Amino acid sequence: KSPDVINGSPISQKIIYKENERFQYKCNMGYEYSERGDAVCTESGWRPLPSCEEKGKCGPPPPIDNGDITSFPLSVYAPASSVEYQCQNLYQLEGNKRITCRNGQWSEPPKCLHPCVISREIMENYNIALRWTAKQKLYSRTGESVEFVCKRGYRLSSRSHTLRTTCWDGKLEYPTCAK
Amino acid sequence: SPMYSIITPNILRLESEETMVLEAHDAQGDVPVTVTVHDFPGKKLVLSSEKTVLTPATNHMGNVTFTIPANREFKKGRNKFVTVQATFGTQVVEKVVLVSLQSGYLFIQTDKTIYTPGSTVLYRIFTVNHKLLPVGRTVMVNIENPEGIPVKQDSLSSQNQLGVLPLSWDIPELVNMGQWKIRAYYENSPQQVFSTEFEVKEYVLPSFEVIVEPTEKFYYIYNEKGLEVTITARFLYGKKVEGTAFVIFGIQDGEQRISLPESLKRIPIEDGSGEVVLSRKVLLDGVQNPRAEDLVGKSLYVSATVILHSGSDMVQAERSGIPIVTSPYQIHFTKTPKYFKPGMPFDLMVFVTNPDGSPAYRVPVAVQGEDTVQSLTQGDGVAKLSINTHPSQKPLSITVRTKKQELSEAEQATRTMQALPYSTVGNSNNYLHLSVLRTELRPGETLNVNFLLRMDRAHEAKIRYYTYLIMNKGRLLKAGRQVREPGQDLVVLPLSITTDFIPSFRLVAYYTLIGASGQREVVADSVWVDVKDSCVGSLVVKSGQSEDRQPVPGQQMTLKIEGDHGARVVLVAVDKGVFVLNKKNKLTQSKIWDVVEKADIGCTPGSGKDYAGVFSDAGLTFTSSSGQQTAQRAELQCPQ
Amino acid sequence: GLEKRQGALELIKKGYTQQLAFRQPSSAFAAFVKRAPSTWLTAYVVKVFSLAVNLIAIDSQVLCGAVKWLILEKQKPDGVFQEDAPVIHQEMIGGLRNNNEKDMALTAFVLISLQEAKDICEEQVNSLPGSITKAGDFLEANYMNLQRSYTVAIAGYALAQMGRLKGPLLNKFLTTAKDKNRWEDPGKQLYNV
Ligand SMILES: *[C@@H]1O[C@H](CO)[C@@H](O[C@@H]2O[C@H](CO)[C@@H](O[C@@H]3O[C@H](CO[C@@H]4O[C@H](CO)[C@@H](O)[C@H](O)[C@@H]4O)[C@@H](O)[C@H](O[C@@H]4O[C@H](CO)[C@@H](O)[C@H](O)[C@@H]4O)[C@@H]3O)[C@H](O)[C@H]2NC(C)=O)[C@H](O)[C@H]1NC(C)=O
Numbered sequence A: 001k002s003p004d005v006i007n008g009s010p011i012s013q014k015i016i017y018k019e020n021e022r023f024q025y026k027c028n029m030g031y032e033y034s035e036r037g038d039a040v041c042t043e044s045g046w047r048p049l050p051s052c053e054e055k056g057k058c059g060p061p062p063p064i065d066n067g068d069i070t071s072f073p074l075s076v077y078a079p080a081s082s083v084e085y086q087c088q089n090l091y092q093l094e095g096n097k098r099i100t101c102r103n104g105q106w107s108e109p110p111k112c113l114h115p116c117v118i119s120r121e122i123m124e125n126y127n128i129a130l131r132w133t134a135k136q137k138l139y140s141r142t143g144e145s146v147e148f149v150c151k152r153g154y155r156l157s158s159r160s161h162t163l164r165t166t167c168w169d170g171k172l173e174y175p176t177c178a179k
Numbered sequence B: 001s002p003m004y005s006i007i008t009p010n011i012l013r014l015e016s017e018e019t020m021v022l023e024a025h026d027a028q029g030d031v032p033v034t035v036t037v038h039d040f041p042g043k044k045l046v047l048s049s050e051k052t053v054l055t056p057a058t059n060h061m062g063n064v065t066f067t068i069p070a071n072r073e074f075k076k077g078r079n080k081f082v083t084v085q086a087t088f089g090t091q092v093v094e095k096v097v098l099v100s101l102q103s104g105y106l107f108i109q110t111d112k113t114i115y116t117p118g119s120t121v122l123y124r125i126f127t128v129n130h131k132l133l134p135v136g137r138t139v140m141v142n143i144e145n146p147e148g149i150p151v152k153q154d155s156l157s158s159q160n161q162l163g164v165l166p167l168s169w170d171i172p173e174l175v176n177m178g179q180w181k182i183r184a185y186y187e188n189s190p191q192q193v194f195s196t197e198f199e200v201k202e203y204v205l206p207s208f209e210v211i212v213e214p215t216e217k218f219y220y221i222y223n224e225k226g227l228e229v230t231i232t233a234r235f236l237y238g239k240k241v242e243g244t245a246f247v248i249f250g251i252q253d254g255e256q257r258i259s260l261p262e263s264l265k266r267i268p269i270e271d272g273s274g275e276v277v278l279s280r281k282v283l284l285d286g287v288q289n290p291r292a293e294d295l296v297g298k299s300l301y302v303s304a305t306v307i308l309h310s311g312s313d314m315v316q317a318e319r320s321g322i323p324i325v326t327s328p329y330q331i332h333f334t335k336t337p338k339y340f341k342p343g344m345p346f347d348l349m350v351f352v353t354n355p356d357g358s359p360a361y362r363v364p365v366a367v368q369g370e371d372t373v374q375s376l377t378q379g380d381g382v383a384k385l386s387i388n389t390h391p392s393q394k395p396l397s398i399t400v401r402t403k404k405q406e407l408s409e410a411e412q413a414t415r416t417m418q419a420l421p422y423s424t425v426g427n428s429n430n431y432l433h434l435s436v437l438r439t440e441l442r443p444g445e446t447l448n449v450n451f452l453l454r455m456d457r458a459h460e461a462k463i464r465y466y467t468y469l470i471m472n473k474g475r476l477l478k479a480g481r482q483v484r485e486p487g488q489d490l491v492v493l494p495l496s497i498t499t500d501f502i503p504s505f506r507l508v509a510y511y512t513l514i515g516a517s518g519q520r521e522v523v524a525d526s527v528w529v530d531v532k533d534s535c536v537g538s539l540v541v542k543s544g545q546s547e548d549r550q551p552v553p554g555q556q557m558t559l560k561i562e563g564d565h566g567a568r569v570v571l572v573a574v575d576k577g578v579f580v581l582n583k584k585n586k587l588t589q590s591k592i593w594d595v596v597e598k599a600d601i602g603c604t605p606g607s608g609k610d611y612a613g614v615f616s617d618a619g620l621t622f623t624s625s626s627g628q629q630t631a632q633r634a635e636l637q638c639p640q
Numbered sequence C: 001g002l003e004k005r006q007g008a009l010e011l012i013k014k015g016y017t018q019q020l021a022f023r024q025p026s027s028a029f030a031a032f033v034k035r036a037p038s039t040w041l042t043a044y045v046v047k048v049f050s051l052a053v054n055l056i057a058i059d060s061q062v063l064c065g066a067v068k069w070l071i072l073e074k075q076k077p078d079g080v081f082q083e084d085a086p087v088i089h090q091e092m093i094g095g096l097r098n099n100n101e102k103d104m105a106l107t108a109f110v111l112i113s114l115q116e117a118k119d120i121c122e123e124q125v126n127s128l129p130g131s132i133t134k135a136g137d138f139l140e141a142n143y144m145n146l147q148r149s150y151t152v153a154i155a156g157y158a159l160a161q162m163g164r165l166k167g168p169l170l171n172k173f174l175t176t177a178k179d180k181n182r183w184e185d186p187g188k189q190l191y192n193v
């Protein structure tokens, strides 16, 4: 079961623990950990006894895709509390970054926009090179404007998309050069 | 300025009650103390956790009694340790203590010593703890053939059996002769294996006993009279024996026996007694060495065969291990401390024995150069020699000789020992000496413990009390304080000796102060005191009837058994013919106390090279908050 | 010596406390408070601290915060870690020094540091498993194009913790060991150990 640490409050929100699961806890003001600061569930019970020595509310915020909150998650949030989100690198956040707890429910969370591939097989099948010198890299964040040109001997076709294209959530319009 | 100190036995045993004494010297008010014992090094479980308070009414001295369960957590294999953590207020004092796997003691008693193929072996296993008190545990028993292969295992319980476990094992008709063994061990301690042997052989009772008894317990190599031996033959019911005896002698060298055919004699056994002399000439002619000095160190054995005139019974008996010596005695310093206090009286426990190892009674002993210091051995062959040491750092070398009058100087026994100066803290020359009159001490008396102090007078008034501890059977029996007034050099402690001191106890006392360069100093001293080996209670079996009434085959008899109230007594009646054939592995009281003393954690007669050596050598671990502590002990066995 | 372990513990506590002074507000780590946070150094602090939770009191917010940092910042969409502020001591990284297959090696290192702190930082960081999976995807795809024994070794252990080291990948892990007992490559011997 979830141990009742004296002069302290748990960090993890889980109540039932299987074997070898760790139980994180922190000590209250004026106290600190004694030896081990966590507890492990073994057959005879918790091996490290959680001890501390002398020196309408909402639930957890909803998880998003390719992102996470900036603070540390809590089991219960007091009313009028607010957390913020942030996407991974080269991802673009779309929507309200901050959500607020009101009357046991959160506000609408944002999403994360997917960047694009600059595929090497597509570049060779369309006969285009980056034209800003590079080995690779410089990859299309959602909203970034890439550019290419044709190879030496090809030209843009009649209805080929512009050489300067912008990626939008995992979709990229590659130019094409024929003849 | 305040110093917190803990003392715990050198080695901690499982399922045994262990005491811990807590002191807060130079402190005021109440000191909350919480003692926790954890495993080493992981601290997965809290093996014990007790609390106490050190109040000024108790002179800031308390104890914590705890029993460590034999948890399934401990793993031949590596040695196991525990962390002892004492918390006084803010301060915490920890010590890493060695753990012994011995759970307690197991004693095996077989009804007989030798058995015929087909018979049943009846044996009882007594299951006690380190206090010899009956306990209820699970015991593993292994029956082992002379070859060594275990042939029958079992796992039984001692619960509701009052510490006595009655078992039996049937011997097959077709069986291998020789020395069989029973091997038992507690379930919790598979490393502590107790054993007893019993011979299996085809035999018949001899109906009488033959006794080969030499005049002396040895043979002086320059005695022209030779070894005179008296043969005493008597029936198992008392009456003497008339017959004829064939006696023959031999020389034993280690394990090589050389019979002397020329020494063979046929003598009449008249009135149950006969005499036969091995002449010195035959002895020298028998061995192929003219130099008699080479026979010294070897032994003689005598074999006698007595045949009744009726020719219906014959008994062969032997008496071996008769050392050929040049001195009737042998001096040992195995009971005398090997550390002295310069300037204070140094006590020596001389141990004079006969060539066969038995104690020697009334033997004059003295120190070379000090004819005044001449003492007499007691009934246990232990004499006390007190000398006066000069204040010095020179190794005190003692040579003790026997001064038995009427014995020439060439035959007097001699032995040489050496003692080292008790090194003090910062060469402060602060010494403590505990002395006790060496004499057979018995339960129910009182021993005066003399605390004698020697130190400079500049800090003698600060010493207001001594801390004394008693070690018995490998556990702390009693701890207390001894009030000492400024100016008094010697104070007397009336120590009441009860049955809890059997067979022996160590008294280690120490005092602490702040001296010299404002350094915290501890000075200690210990002494070993022997007690008259006996039972804790009593058990006597005597005749419960009139001694005009003679025992007759089949006749009812009354047996008077007088012992402790509520005790469960187990009995056995054995024919003395059995003991005429084999008298080994017999359960006595002396053997029980022998086993107990061999599982002792002390390794010295007394004292040590420093204040930590006194505690370590007396089986104790001292650890103060200021940092003064004893070195670690990682050896279950004492140092050689 | 049983008594020495206490002082040995004191040093670890001391070191941990001393390392807290360089924890940037982003729950990252760098040689100096003003210096830009290093990817490899933050991952290495996770490593040591994850193996030390059984010895002294390690705060979960510190360890788990560093993990959440590496995932949201130093993680590319393909899934591979990039060190944006190289450590000043290039001799404390071992085999990643001057390594050409830096992407594969650095990915394996940071990933292993994540999987060692999984059981500890699974409640607070909710994005941990997906990132472990993302790192694992890149290592699996370009594992066979390895050449350096070191990279094959470190990526093999990074994949064995997931059970994703089978087939031709497992074959390459076993055949790169010369004499069937060592993963050796021309250069410093410390890299081969
Ligand atoms: C650890 O520390 C404890 C502290 O209590 C020590 O226990 C002392 O041990 C004494 C052994 O010598 C015991 O004294 C005995 O007490 C008998 C009374 O029995 C008590 O019954 C109560 C039940 O209410 C129990 O709780 C107690 O534990 C006792 O069993 C007395 O008949 C008898 O004598 C007394 O002490 C002196 C002796 O000179 C008399 O002057 C006094 O008037 C009184 O009659 C007997 O000696 C007792 O358990 C206890 N005594 C005291 C004073 O605390 C442990 O011995 C310590 N253990 C170690 C290893 O150091």
Ligand SMILES: [Ca+2]
Pocket: B503, B504, B530, B531, B532, B533
């Ligand atoms: Ca004795």
